[PDB]
């Protein structure tokens, strides 16, 4: 059972240095996520923000998940 | 029967050092779980909190579960 | 699991210097994306703009994606 | 049966001087396991830590394992 | 069994003077890993950084791996 | 195992004096990589630049690669 | 491995005095690459130009190539 | 049977004056087993150490081995 | 068996006065192992260094090797 | 075994007074290794330089090589 | 081994007074290497130049070559 167990543990241990990186990605990008037509520009910046947030909540699941079954 | 029995025992023995880790994950993440639009930010922090709590109650089941049948 | 894990990490790490380049491409092109018939010209410039923006939001997914399954 | 028996015994006898070494490896490495981007660095140090811990629990199995069947 | 056993041991013993070298390689290279177009340059430096980090975590596996089976 | 091990080590040791040379090649060439038609010339200079950058990231892999398997 | 290694190194070292020559060839030729029919002449001069440019980008590959495999 | 028997006996009798010598070799060498690049040197000294240790455990096998079959 | 046995012994006995010489060779050479193009020179000095180090670890094997089989 | 052994030793002993000579050859030649067409001359000088450098690294191999097998 | 060794040494020692001569030959000839048809003459002078340059690079090989094998 430890095969999955560690997979889970690792996934938990890896969540904060991944979500650390992840956020540096999304900030490094937010400048490049808005569509200017004339003068009025319209971002889709914080769409991609959410990508990260449910990715966040999601990883801490995967860990806790792979500890308890398929 | 001991094949499952130990699987259960292990799962109980492993519950507090897993929920130890787990919590360090969710705190290491709570900074990175909120979606700021203008100035007003809106977390989904404690959603992921719950992920852990029913994961908690859940593991102590799995242990006690694999001791008594499919 | 690290095989995919890194694939993900790399993909996140690579998102801002890719979206850096990408944007230099789309600006280097916007002059060459409009169809002049008589005198009235009609761009399709910012079509290609969007190409980049959902490409943007998309990469930060791929990273976070390859960390959690097929 | 002694063919496997000793394989097991050896594996047990070898567990503490292997996990002795192993740990010196993982400490000798933890300096070289973190990805600095600007100023903010983000380790994946203790991922590799776990590698050792379930490797640990795992070896003491292999010993006890090769004593009792395929 | 010692044939693999040592292969493993060696691999552990060799991990910190390899990851010592490895890092001197990646620093000796980071100057030569960025693509300047006009004035704005865009590195892919820390992509190659990660190459090393999962290489790191990976070696300490290989050691512990070749001790326990195919 | 040392047969591959050294191949790897060498490859790491050789990465910075190769990427040293490599860059002197690509600069010695960038003058000779642009196609002038009338007056307007159009380089493909920094295409060949990238050749080097993923060659870079690539070598530091090969080293770390030949240490761990086929 | 040095057999290929040097082949590569040489190829890099040889790229700028080859692309030096090469260009003197293509200029020495551009006078003799246009098909005059009546009065209107039509060159194919800069076709042969490109021959050199992708030859350029190509050599700096071959070098970096023969360092890393078949 | 004595043909192999003695081969074994000899091999046992020869193990401590061989491992006596062997160690004098590996110490006489450890000064000449480290790769200094700038100032930071990185040994591979104790790799070769292990060479001896599993050589050790190995000889005492060969003896006991050639007493009992192919 | 002594035919190989001595071959081994000799090889061990010969390792430190060979690696003594060897190193005097590689130092006597390191001045003559760097390729200067304009002003910037680029050594491949410590490539040849490694040649010696795995040669080192390798000899102490050959000795211990020729004591135990083909 | 000494037949090859000395061949090796000699080859090591001979490496620095050969690479001494060798370099005097390549300097005595570098004046006579460049192809001037009009006014612009283009050397292939440092091609031949490399000839020596991998010849260098190569000899110190041959020595260490002929000590350990075909 | 000295039979080839000297052949090599000699070949190195002989390279600069041969390439000394060689060049006096090719200059003594360059007047007599161009085909004049009407008034426009067309040399093949520097073809023969190259003959010497790769002859150059080539000799310094032969020396270093005959030191290390068939």
Residue numbers in the entry:
A (entry chain A), B (entry chain A), C (entry chain A), D (entry chain A), E (entry chain A), F (entry chain A), ...: 10 to 79
Q: What wording appears in the published article?
A:
An excellent model for such studies is the non-enveloped bacilliform virus APBV1 infecting the archaeon Aeropyrum pernix that has the highest optimal growth temperature, 90 °C, among aerobic hyperthermophiles. The double-stranded, circular DNA genome of the virus (5.3 kbp) is among the smallest known dsDNA genomes. It encodes for the major capsid protein (MCP) VP1 (8.3 kDa) in addition to three minor capsid proteins VP2 (9.7 kDa), VP3 (11.2 kDa), and VP4 (21.4 kDa). To study the molecular basis of the extreme temperature resistance of APBV1, we have determined the three-dimensional structure of the purified APBV1 virion using electron cryomicroscopy (cryo-EM) to ~3-Å resolution.
Two-dimensional image classification of the segments and Fourier–Bessel analysis of power spectra calculated from 2D class averages revealed a defined helical symmetry (rise 6.10 Å, turn 16.55 degrees, 21.75 units per turn, pitch 133.7 Å), cyclic symmetry (C5), and the polar nature of the capsid structure. In the cryo-EM map, the fold of the VP1 glycoprotein and the density for most of the large amino acid side-chains were resolved, allowing us to build a VP1 atomic model de novo and refine it. VP1 is almost entirely α-helical, consisting of two long α-helices (α1, residues 5–42; α2, residues 53–77) linked by a type 1 beta hairpin (residues 43–52), and flexible termini (N-term, residues 1–4; C-term, 78–81). Two adjacent prolines (Pro25 and Pro26) mediate a kink in α1, which facilitated initial assignment of the sequence to the density. α2 is also curved at Gly66, but to lesser extent than α1. The arrangement of the VP1 subunits in the capsid resembles the blades of an impeller, with the small size of the VP1 protein, and more specifically the curvature of the VP1 α-helices α1 and α2, allowing very compact packing of subunits. Each VP1 subunit makes extensive hydrophobic contacts to six other neighboring VP1 subunits, resulting in a large interface area of 2916 Å2 (55.5% of the total solvent accessible area of the subunit). A large number of aliphatic residues pack closely with each other, with Leu14, Leu21, Ala24, Met28, Ala31, and Val35 of α1 packing against Met61, Leu68, Val69, Leu73, and Ile76 of α2 to form a very tight hydrophobic interface. VP1 is glycosylated, and sequence analysis using NetNGlyc13 revealed an N-linked glycosylation sequon (46-NST-50) located at the tip of the loop region. Although the density map does not direct assignment of the VP1–DNA contacts, or an unambiguous determination of the DNA conformation, it suggests that the DNA follows the positively charged helical tracks formed by the VP1 residues Lys9 and Arg79 exposed on the inner surface of the helical capsid.
